[PDB]
Amino acid sequence: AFDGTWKVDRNENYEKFMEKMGINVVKRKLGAHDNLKLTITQEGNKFTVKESSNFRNIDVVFELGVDFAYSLADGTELTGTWTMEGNKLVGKFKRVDNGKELIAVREISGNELIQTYTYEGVEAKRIFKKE
């Protein structure tokens, strides 16, 4: 499953995606080399994601199908839910400032974790390798 420690390996169109979100040139360069690592653990229907990066270290806890709030490193607030679809986790979120939709998907491909995002017509991916 998703269980395990994952470390980012490569990105696809991440800087353009961050530009759309409103992130400055400098912060995009730092964002793209954030050394993000995720430690995922499950307990029933609830997941615990320990996010660790050059920017911060925090725990994210969520129950499938129940909305929760999550903030980006820069303070941008989102609210949404994750649900299990087939073998994938599909996340439906909204920016609380502008009300715009942001979708995220987590899926396993071989031994890699692929995280895809879409926002205002732009797609980006972050691919992680298992530790």
Ligand X SMILES: CCCCCCCCCCCCCC(=O)O
DSSP H stretches of helix in 25-87:
25-31
Q: How far is the CB of 110 from ligand X (least distance, A)?
A: 21
Using the 8-state DSSP alphabet, how is residue 26 labeled?
A: H
First to last CA, the chain: 14
Q: Is 60 in the site for ligand X (CB under 6 A)?
A: yes
Provide the residue type at 63 as one letter: E
Q: Residues, the chain, total? A: 131
Helix (H) or strand (E) holding 119: strand 112-119
Q: How far is the CB of 75 from ligand X (least distance, A)?
A: 10
Q: How far is the CB of 115 from ligand X (least distance, A)?
A: 7
Chain residues 7-26 in contact with ligand X, contact rule CB under 6 A: 18, 23
Burial letters for 27-40: b for 16+ Cβ neighbours within 10 Å, e otherwise? ebeebeebebbbeb
Answer yes or no: is 82 a known binding residue.
Answer: yes
Nearer to ligand X by Cβ, of 29 and 86: the residue is 29
**Which is nearest to 53 in space by CA: 115, 7, 103?**
7
Q: Is 117 in the site for ligand X (CB under 6 A)?
A: yes
Nearer to ligand X by Cβ, of 18 and 113: the residue is 18
Q: How far is the CB of 31 from ligand X (least distance, A)?
A: 4
Interface residues toward ligand X, by CB under 6 A: 18, 23, 31, 49, 60, 70, 72-73, 91, 104, 117
